[PDB]
């Protein structure tokens, strides 16, 4: 039973003039509704500082707990995974990782060549207001360089790590080799003792430490060579969104990695006002590297 | 069945029966094994579990079945692909399952018809009296009796089974379970007419025989006896679907239509967008949870419960929840005369004296006009009415009022006694002042009452004498006129018949009254009177007047039938009495309007063949059961449509079913009001069956969807207004909870069309439908009426949900809630760092745990936890924004045609509900602990304000339209926005 009744107009609910009326009414209703919504969004916009977040630091839900992030990153359409896959050797798939690492480190070479507002900061030299502290690429050694295919050539990949830039964050670093907590790897404690014995200025920095997650990944990962300082420094961190900001990076270097064997790594920062958790991944990052 | 027509010998040879011994034991065993029900066969019943189990499945529950299962599969995918995944989809999976059961349990309570009408026939016939089988009387069991068996009935033994009366004397039985009337009917061993229900030759299963012995052969026992058929036919009958249930099922069909169509569409635009199996699975449980209202069928069940609780406070008990409303959508209401429209108390109405007729008070409360007490003929007539060998009251009911006092005697003897008791105040004083010395009982042919009373001065003897007026017309030679004894002339005889036929004109049974003064010289003190051979004058007495008796209506009845016919509801008498009495009461109560004449009346006035009289000319109808029997459905529907005030009389209990099924053919919803076993089929077949709470039989109560405990027929009119009020209030709850579905749904379709991070969480949705938006939806059951729906949609001839409601819930008002909700979502994201330019296209990375450093518009980097923490705060804010734009939604749904300033916020539940709405939202989002499974986080005191401007816009818009629609009445605006 169609009961269409097209002969007496009746386009299933009304005549042509009635449909025209309801359509123009709906069109205008939605038009001024979108107008009201856009006006309210503009009214909200005029009360925003586009350079500084309305809620900063601890007021927001970002909090005072930053998290790390490995840079090489998986390819797009693989946003679910954290795996870096490549085959060492001339006939290898190194190209994507090498090109991505080159692209990320682009601002650290081009704009730093001029450095109009860049400041050659140091541990005893605080930055000037409105000036982002410099980060020379040569500070990342020679192996983590695009010239040596960013290390993805000889079978010794090197992966950059960076801290989250929480706005207005004020890192607090340990002031003694006794203030440091437990559960820190003995390598980092020995490094801290060496730094404290040496130049006491260098101990003012946030400490990184990469280790395998699974108990077997502890011994299947091999040694790690943090080519720059073993952790980010502490004279970049009051972020404040300076234009042309360069985040400090710590470049790992997986010297010994068994072929065809997956390794899951977890790197955690070590500062007093930084938490660490294996589940929410607070104050830590998790990436998986496998070499074939 | 023509066994009453055929002679006794024919039936005896048909059944092998004997007029003196009936049957033998072996033949009794044979008849038992052939058929031995002799009782009402128990009805087929379905268990509660299967009815509940099939109530667990529907349109709103089958979808939640698919939703509940899907998150169970989703949790399995997460567990075996992530061994340390917390339990979020599993507990949501359990939650949606609990919604299925709780809503699958609210529906059960709505349809919980507890009517064991078969177990209501508890009386039947225990302790069978006597049977003449084997030449001896046996006081055997109730059921063993079979056909071909001679039974021995006496006084008040509930005739054992349908017996062809064979022999009897002074036999009167009361088939009050057949025609409602309890007046005794004399039975004789002779068929009087073809119809077996109106012959004195046949007894019946259910008659508590008043007097007369009786002998009969059992024609049948149970399931074929007249009572047996009705009980079986009453048990195996269902009204079908109540009008509110049909609308609700239509409502479910409409919403399930969009929900299954939208989910089917979004199973196509998802899979064509790259969503993995889990992403689509997680998405599907969003667009089938926002769409289906989890707290709507439960809301309607409670809304009906509240008005049933309120309507029961007016002594109107309701057995079926959904039967509360169907007194509002009904349009034709059948009825019953004796017991429902009348007091079932034969009382005097009109009095003939001194060539005058005046009406006597008949109200139970005795509020009538006693203007006749000053008449000169009043004292003599009441003296004759009281001294005529009389009847007596009861001592054990003496303390009750005079009308409520029980009597011993016939109904006619009862009526005169109450009237005399009411008039003179205390006729016992007349008893004390007037002793009795002689009396003659009512016979079966002469049936007079002669008594002799000693004169107060002790000088002579007084003669009292009442009987049928025709019989005492010849026995009277003089007539009392204005206190003067006037000889009966030709003028008086013509006047006597004129009043007599006029009195019978209104069907009022009458009996004449006359007296005579015995001479003192011929009958001095100590005169001996012989009763067998009278020694006093019997004829040529002094006529006094005529008394009338008719079963009068109650006090509330004349108003109720007047208001019911004013609310669009036509009323039809469906009785079992003679048409003359039915026509008299029908005109009296108001069913037949004054000045409206039927074919017989019109033809009578024209003195022409009633056949030639045009049916159109007539308005009312007095169709008799015999005429109703031989006409088919074609003419029956014609007379139901042609006229409007039909009065069906002399209708068998199975003919009331034909009437109700006849009326329902037009598409109307019939209501039946009755008291007795006869109308049990009509009560079960009608959409709503209203019974009587005091003057109603046991089966009539147990086979009805409503009970009038106070017997006030005026409660029907109140039920109509309350039935039409709850229907509109329910519709205003539907239009309110359907406005939450698009603000709940919009974040999901905005999550897939454009790639925005999710705004509303599925768990958050369950906190709206099952949570806050329950008490306000319940509160609308308390909303008072506005204007009158008497003229607009008189019997609510409209759908519960229609295109105007969808266009006003899913359309105009609903969209302005989604925009208001999303404005808060963009405010928090913009304030915390994620500007709207960055938000679009961020779905892939937002959910992904690979990116621990996703950047906002100010260069920050959020972790996965701080991203999700921010998203859950927006989930809370969207929830509160939906709640805040629901304050205005409630207020603008409180009214439907009148502005708020006219109606006034004077609904106690509603004002409390608004406080309950905010407090639950505030409590659920500001206490440590509910960020641990409900995903609810504290909000800044500045994040409750963003949705407020959209709340004001909705209120200003709706009230503005109301002004336009109340103006320009019938304007296309109303034509396409008035739900
Ligand atoms: F008055 Al009835 F059935 F009770 F016709």
Angstrom distance (rounded) from CA B700 to CA B683: 8
To 10 degrees, what angle do helices B948-966 and B813-832 make?
A: 160
User: Distance of alpha carbon B378 from its chain centroid, rounded?
Assistant: 44
By most ligand atoms within 8 Å of CB, the mutation choice from B180, B342, B650, B691 for ligand 1 is B180
Angstrom distance (rounded) from CA B385 to CA A127: 125
Angstrom distance (rounded) from CA B303 to CA B297: 10
Tell me if residue B205 falls in helix, strand or coil.
coil
Angstrom distance (rounded) from CA B528 to CA B518: 13
CA–CA distances in Å: residue B687 to residues B239, B315, B517, B703, B835: 6, 21, 63, 12, 60
Does the Cβ of B680 fall within 6 Å of ligand 1?
A: no
- DSSP sequence for B47-83: -HHHHHHHHS-SSTTHHHHHHHHHHHHHHHHHHHH-T
Q: Which phi and psi angles does B467 have, rounded to 5°?
A: -175, -170
Active site residue B336: yes
Tell me if residue B837 falls in helix, strand or coil.
helix
- Residue holding tokens 């960076």? A162
Angstrom distance (rounded) from CA B71 to CA B76: 8
CA of B676 to the centre of ligand 1 (A): 7
- Domains assigned to chain B: 8-34+123-233 (2.70.150.10), 54-108+242-308+723-975 (1.20.1110.10), 350-549 (3.40.1110.10), 562-700 (3.40.50.1000)
Angstrom distance (rounded) from CA B302 to CA B726: 12
To 10 degrees, what angle do helices B741-752 and B277-287 make?
A: 160
Interface test with A, best of B853, B872, B956, B965 (most A CBs within 10 A): B853
Angstrom distance (rounded) from CA B857 to CA B442: 110
Contact between B831 and A54 using a beta-carbon 8 Å cutoff: yes
What sign results for the dihedral spanned by CA atoms B258, B264, B269, B274?
A: positive
Angstrom distance (rounded) from CA B243 to CA B249: 10
Angstrom distance (rounded) from CA B386 to CA B405: 17
User: Distance of alpha carbon B767 from its chain centroid, rounded?
Assistant: 38
For residue B165, give the H/E element and its range: strand B162-167
Residues of B in contact with A67 (CB under 8 A): 852-853, 861, 863, 865-866
CATH number of A68-291: 2.60.40.1660
Tell me if residue A286 falls in helix, strand or coil.
strand
Residues contacting B5, CB < 8 A, separation 6+: B191, B194
- DSSP sequence for B365-417: T--S---STT-THHHHHHHHHHHSS--EE-STTTTS-TTTS-EES-HHHHHHH
**Cross-strand pairs, B898:** none
Task: Report the Cα–Cα distance between both ends of chain A, in Å, rounded.
Answer: 67
Pair B59, B255: CB distance under 8 Å: yes
Nearest to B810 by CA among B423, B433, B307, B262: B262
- For residue B976, the tally of other CB atoms under 10 A from its CB is 17
Q: Which phi and psi angles does B544 have, rounded to 5°?
A: -110, -60
Pair B647, B591: CB distance under 8 Å: yes
By most ligand atoms within 8 Å of CB, the mutation choice from B175, B579, B650, B675 for ligand 1 is B675
**HSE-up of B656 (CA within 13 Å, CB side)?**
37
Contact between B851 and A245 using a beta-carbon 8 Å cutoff: no
Strands B570-574 and B645-648: parallel
User: Distance of alpha carbon B766 from its chain centroid, rounded?
Assistant: 37
Contact between B862 and A81 using a beta-carbon 8 Å cutoff: no
Residues of A in contact with B852 (CB under 8 A): 67-69, 164, 281, 285-286
CA of B575 to the centre of ligand 1 (A): 5
Pair B873, B828: CB distance under 8 Å: yes
Q: Which two tokens stand for residue B893?
A: 């749904």
Pick from A48, A81, A281: which is nearest to B852 by CB?
A281
- Helix (H), strand (E) counts: chain A: 5, 7
- Residue holding tokens 């225990």? B126
Residues contacting B476, CB < 8 A, separation 6+: B488, B512, B514, B540, B541, B542, B543
For residue B847, give the H/E element and its range: helix B843-847
Breaks (C-N over 2.5 A) in chain B follow: none
Angstrom distance (rounded) from CA A16 to CA A8: 11
State the Cα angle at A11 between A7 and A13, rounded to 5°: 125
**Cross-strand pairs, B318:** B706
Q: Which two tokens stand for residue B855?
A: 């950047």
Pair B743, B821: CB distance under 8 Å: yes
Residue nearest to atom 1 of ligand 1 (CA): B338
Strands B407-408 and B436-439: unpaired
Nearest to A233 by CA among A131, A107, A124: A124
The DSSP output letter for B40 is P
Tell me if residue B172 falls in helix, strand or coil.
strand
Pair B74, B281: CB distance under 8 Å: yes
Query: Residue ranges per domain, chain A?
Result: 1-48, 68-291
Q: Which two tokens stand for residue A74?
A: 């998986």
**Cross-strand pairs, B451:** B439, B464
Task: Report the Cα–Cα distance between both ends of chain B, in Å, rounded.
Answer: 57
Interface contacts (A, B; CB < 8 Å): 122
Angstrom distance (rounded) from CA A52 to CA A167: 8
Q: Which two tokens stand for residue B876?
A: 């809370």
Pair B889, B739: CB distance under 8 Å: yes
Q: Which two tokens stand for residue A23?
A: 């359509």
Angstrom distance (rounded) from CA B406 to CA B131: 34
**Cross-strand pairs, B708:** B316, B692
Tell me if residue B689 falls in helix, strand or coil.
strand
For residue B273, give the H/E element and its range: none
Angstrom distance (rounded) from CA B914 to CA A158: 61
Q: Which two tokens stand for residue B252?
A: 């479910």
Angstrom distance (rounded) from CA B74 to CA B38: 63
Nearest to B770 by CA among B778, B759, B780: B778
- For residue B37, the tally of other CB atoms under 10 A from its CB is 16
Does the Cβ of B337 fall within 6 Å of ligand 1?
A: yes
Torsion angle, CA of A21/A23/A26/A30, rounded to 10 degrees?
A: -130
Q: Which two tokens stand for residue B400?
A: 């009750």
The DSSP output letter for A128 is P
Catalytic pick from B174, B336, B515, B711? B336
Nearest to B347 by CA among B442, B413, B430, B400: B413
How much of chain A is helix, strand and coil, in % rounded to 5?
A: 25, 15, 60
- Helix (H), strand (E) counts: chain B: 37, 27
Angstrom distance (rounded) from CA B347 to CA B644: 30
């Amino acid at each position: 039973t169609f009961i269409w009744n097209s002969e007496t107009s009746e386009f299933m609910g009304r005549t042509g003039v009635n449909w025209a009326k309801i359509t123009i009414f709906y069109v205008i209703f939605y038009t001024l509704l979108a107008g009201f919504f856009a006006g309210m969004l503009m009214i909200f916009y005029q009360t925003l500082d586009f350079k500084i977040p309305k809620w900063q630091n601890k007021d927001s839900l970002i909090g005072t707990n930053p998290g790390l992030g490995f840079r090489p990153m998986p390819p797009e359409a693989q946003v679910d995974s954290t795996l870096i896959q490549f085959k060492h050797g001339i006939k290898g798939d190194w190209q994507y990782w090498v090109h991505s690492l080159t692209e990320f480190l682009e601002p650290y070479e081009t704009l730093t060549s001029s450095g109009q507002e860049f400041t050659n900061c140091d541990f005893d030299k605080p930055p000037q207001e409105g000036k982002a502290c410099n980060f020379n690429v040569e500070l990342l050694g020679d192996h983590c360089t695009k010239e040596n295919n960013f290390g993805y050539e000889l079978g010794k990949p090197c992966v950059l790590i960076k801290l989250n830039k929480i706005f207005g964050w004020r890192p607090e670093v340990y002031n003694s080799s006794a203030e440091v907590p437990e559960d820190m790897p003995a390598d980092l404690k020995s490094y801290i003792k060496d730094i404290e014995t040496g130049n006491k200025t260098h101990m003012n920095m946030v400490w990184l430490s990469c280790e395998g997650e699974t108990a077997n990944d502890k011994e299947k990962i091999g040694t790690i060579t943090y080519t720059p300082f073993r952790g980010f420094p502490a004279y970049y961190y009051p972020y404040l969104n300076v234009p042309g900001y360069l985040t400090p990076v710590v470049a790992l270097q997986f010297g010994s990695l068994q072929n065809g064997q997956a390794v899951n790594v977890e790197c955690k920062a070590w500062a007093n006002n930084i938490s660490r958790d294996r589940q929410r991944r607070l104050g830590s990052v998790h990436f998986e590297i496998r070499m074939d | 069945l023509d066994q009453h027509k055929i002679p006794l010998e024919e039936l005896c040879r048909r059944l092998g029966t004997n007029t003196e011994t009936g049957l033998t034991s072996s033949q009794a065993k044979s008849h038992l094994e052939k058929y031995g029900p002799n009782a009402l066969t128990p009805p087929r019943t379905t268990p509660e579990w299967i009815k509940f189990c099939k109530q667990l499945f529907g349109g709103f529950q089958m979808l939640l079945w698919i939703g509940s299962i899907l998150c169970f599969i989703a949790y399995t995918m997460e567990k075996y692909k992530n061994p340390d995944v917390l339990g979020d989809n599993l507990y949501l999976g359990l939650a949606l399952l609990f919604v299925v059961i709780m809503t699958g349990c609210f529906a059960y309570y709505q349809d919980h018809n507890a009517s064991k009408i078969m177990d209501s026939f508890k009386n039947l016939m225990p302790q069978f009296a006597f049977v003449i089988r084997d030449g001896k009387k046996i006081q055997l069991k109730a059921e063993e009796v079979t056909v071909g068996d001679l039974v021995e009935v006496k006084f008040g033994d509930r005739i054992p089974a349908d017996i062809r009366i064979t022999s009897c004397q002074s036999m009167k039985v009361d088939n009050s379970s057949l025609t409602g009337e309890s007046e005794p009917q004399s039975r004789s061993t002779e068929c009087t007419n073809d119809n077996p229900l109106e012959t004195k030759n046949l007894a019946f299963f259910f008659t508590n025989t008043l007097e007369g012995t009786g002998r009969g052969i059992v024609i049948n026992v149970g399931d074929d006896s007249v009572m047996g058929r009705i009980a079986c036919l009453a048990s195996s009958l269902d009204s079908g679907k109540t009008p509110i249930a049909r609308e609700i099922e239509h409502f479910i069909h409409i919403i399930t239509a969009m929900a299954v169509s939208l989910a089917a569409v979004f199973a196509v635009i998802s899979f064509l967008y790259g969503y993995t199996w889990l992403e689509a699975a997680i998405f599907m449980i969003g667009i089938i949870v926002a769409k289906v209202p989890e707290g709507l069928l439960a809301t309607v069940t409670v809304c009906l419960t509240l008005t049933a609780k309120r309507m029961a406070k007016k002594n109107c008990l309701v057995r079926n929840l959904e039967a509360v409303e169907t007194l509002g959508s009904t349009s034709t209401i059948c009825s019953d005369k004796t017991g429902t429209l009348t007091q079932n108390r034969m009382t005097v109405a009109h009095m003939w004296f001194d060539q005058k007729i005046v009406t006597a008070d008949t109200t139970e409360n005795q509020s009538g006009n006693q203007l006749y007490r000053g008449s000169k003929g009043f004292p003599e007539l009441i003296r004759v009415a009281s001294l005529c060998s009389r009847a007596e009251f009861k001592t054990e009911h003496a303390h009750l009022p005079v009308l409520k006092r029980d009597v011993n005697g016939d109904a006619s003897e009862a009526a005169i006694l109450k009237f005399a008791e009411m008039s003179t105040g205390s006729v016992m004083n007349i008893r004390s002042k007037q002793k009795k010395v002689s009396e003659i009982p009512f016979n079966s042919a002469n049936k007079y009452q002669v008594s002799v009373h000693e004169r107060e001065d002790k000088s002579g003897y007084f003669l009292v004498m009442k009987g049928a007026p025709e019989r005492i017309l010849e026995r009277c030679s003089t007539i009392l006129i204005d206190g003067t004894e006037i000889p009966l002339d030709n003028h008086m005889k013509e006047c006597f018949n004129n009043a007599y036929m006029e009195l019978g004109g209104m069907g009022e049974r009458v009996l004449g009254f006359c007296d005579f003064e015995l001479p003192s010289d011929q009958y001095p003190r100590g005169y001996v009177f012989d009763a067998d051979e009278p020694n006093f004058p019997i004829s040529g007495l002094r006529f006094v007047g005529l008394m009338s008796m008719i079963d009068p209506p109650r006090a509330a009845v004349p108003d109720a039938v007047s208001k019911c016919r004013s609310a669009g509801i036509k009323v039809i008498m469906v009785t079992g009495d003679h048409p003359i009495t039915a026509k008299a009461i029908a005109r009296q109560v108001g069913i037949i309007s004054e000045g409206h004449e039927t074919v017989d009346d019109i033809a009578a006035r024209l003195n022409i063949p009633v056949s030639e009289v045009n049916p159109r000319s007539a308005q009312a109808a007095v169709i008799h059961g015999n005429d109703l029997k031989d006409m088919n459905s074609d003419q029956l529907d014609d007379i139901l449509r042609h006229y409007r005030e039909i009065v069906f009389a002399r209708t068998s209990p199975q003919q009331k079913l034909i009437i109700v099924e006849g009326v329902q053919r037009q598409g109307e919803f019939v209501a039946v009001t009755g008291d007795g076993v006869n109308d049990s089929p009509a009560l079960k077949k009608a959409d709503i069956g209203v019974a009587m709470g005091i003057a109603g039989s046991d089966v009539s109560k147990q086979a009805a969807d409503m009970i009038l405990l106070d017997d006030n027929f005026a409660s029907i009119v109140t039920g109509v207004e309350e039935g039409r009020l709850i229907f509109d209030n329910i519709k205003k709850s539907i239009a309110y909870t359907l406005t939450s579905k698009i603000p709940e749904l919009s974040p999901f379709l905005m999550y897939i069309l454009f790639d925005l991070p999710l705004a509303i969480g599925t768990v958050t949705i369950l906190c709206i439908d099952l949570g806050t938006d329950v008490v306000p939806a319940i509160s609308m059951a308390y909303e008072g009426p506005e204007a009158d729906p008497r003229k607009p949609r008189d019997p609510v001839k409209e759908k519960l949900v229609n295109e105007r409601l969808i266009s006003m819930a899913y359309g105009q008002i609903g969209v302005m809630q989604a925009f208001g909700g999303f404005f808060t979502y963009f405010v928090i994201m913009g304030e915390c760092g994620f500007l709207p330019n960055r938000l679009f296209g961020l779905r892939k990375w937002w959910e992904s745990k690979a990116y621990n450093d996703l950047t906002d518009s100010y260069g920050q980097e959020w972790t996965w936890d701080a991203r999700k923490q921010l998203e859950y705060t927006c989930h809370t804010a969207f929830f509160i924004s939906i709640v805040i734009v629901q304050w205005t939604d409630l207020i603008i749904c409180k009214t439907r045609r009148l502005s708020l300033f006219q109606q006034g916020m004077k609904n106690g539940t509603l004002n409390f509900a608004l406080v309950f709405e905010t407090c639950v939202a505030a409590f659920l989002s500001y206490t440590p602990g509910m960020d641990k499974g409900l995903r609810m986080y504290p909000l800044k005191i500045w994040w409750w304000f963003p949705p407020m401007p959209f709340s004001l816009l909705i209120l200003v818009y709706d009230e503005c339209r109301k002004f336009l629609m109340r103006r320009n009445p019938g304007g296309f605006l109303e034509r396409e926005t008035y739900y």
